[PDB]
């Protein structure tokens, strides 16, 4: 693996984390997702899953 520095400038994409992309599209939440992220909500419901469906937290958290 490659030393992945956090340098995170111009937003994260929420859900595959990448900063570097042409449109920021909004996903089920609203939140500031790439282009290729938002369109797999559009086909589906979910986003492109890396890290299993273990973050689909439903505690009440209204944000
Ligand atoms: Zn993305």
Do not use: D, F
Request: glycine residues 8%; aromatic residues 4%; hydrophobic residues 30%.
């Amino acid at each position: 693996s490659h030393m992945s520095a956090s340098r995170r400038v111009g937003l994260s994409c929420a859900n595959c984390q990448t900063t570097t992309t042409t449109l920021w599209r909004r996903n089920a939440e609203g939140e500031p997702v790439c282009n290729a992220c938002g369109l797999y909500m559009k086909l589906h419901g979910v986003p492109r899953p890396l890290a299993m469906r273990k973050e689909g937290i439903q505690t009440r958290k209204r944000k």
